[PDB]
Amino acid sequence: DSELQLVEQRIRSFPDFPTPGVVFRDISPVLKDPASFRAAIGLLARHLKATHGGRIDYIAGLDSRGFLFGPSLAQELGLGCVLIRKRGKLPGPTLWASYSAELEIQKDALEPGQRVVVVDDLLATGGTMNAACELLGRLQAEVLECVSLVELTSLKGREKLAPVPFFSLLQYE
């Protein structure tokens, strides 16, 4: 897949950053190469339309690297994007949940029954995405799927999110 190759060639890996043991996957080059970024968004959008048809109401982007992809993915799908932030950043009444640290969402971000897909750059343990799903569930929204560019399969984040479906463009151990 030519388009998927355009994304994979723009992920750079940094052993022992930010601490010894972690291999950091840097999506910065995907953003810098407009063909790579277009490919990533298109692949995610095609998957989501093929899987959910017209059932998605909103994309939810996760602070902060998910913000890089959420609005462009939403736009490609003809949808709005809602924000899930690190605690302390949002005005108005909020709910919050531990993700490791805490994520937060505005109490009026969604109405009950609205259907949402969550996007982040990378799934590791699944703590961050799981916190997002908890918050969305507490607004009585339905999480249709979580998606990312990168998935670290040895950390079993997919299993943590089950039964919420998960999809990634690229997998590393």
Added chain:
Amino acid sequence: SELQLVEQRIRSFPDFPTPGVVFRDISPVLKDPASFRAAIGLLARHLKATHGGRIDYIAGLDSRGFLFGPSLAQELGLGCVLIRKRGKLPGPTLWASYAELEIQKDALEPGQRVVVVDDLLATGGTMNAACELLGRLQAEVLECVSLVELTSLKGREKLAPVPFFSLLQYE
């Protein structure tokens, strides 16, 4: 009418995060696809009319600037480089105080021309640090842009002589 589509989706919260201030919340712009599209289109039209073919990259500022940078870059046919809170980026970096921002040393080459984007200009401290970092890579900052500007805080003056443009102004 496009600008109206953006203005009508800014929501103002008094006394957040401290008493006396008004927080301008861009969340409803993001939530309404027509409003977001209008905002990106107005910024892009400004930048093309002002700079023609001179822009090489957009630089988006962590975190809310990340919401607009990539879409703006895509609309202009350009890539987007990232300026982050210190500690977040791998590899060789430069940093600048103001809290600290950081950029990867290979983000830009000497001579490359960039426009910086963030959601809101207040005191101008954040954008000023971004411009400092970019100048230290020997990049040229053509302009800084935002959706919202708080004019009583004199951010524009802080940035001078780097040009600045906002879609919307509040005291």
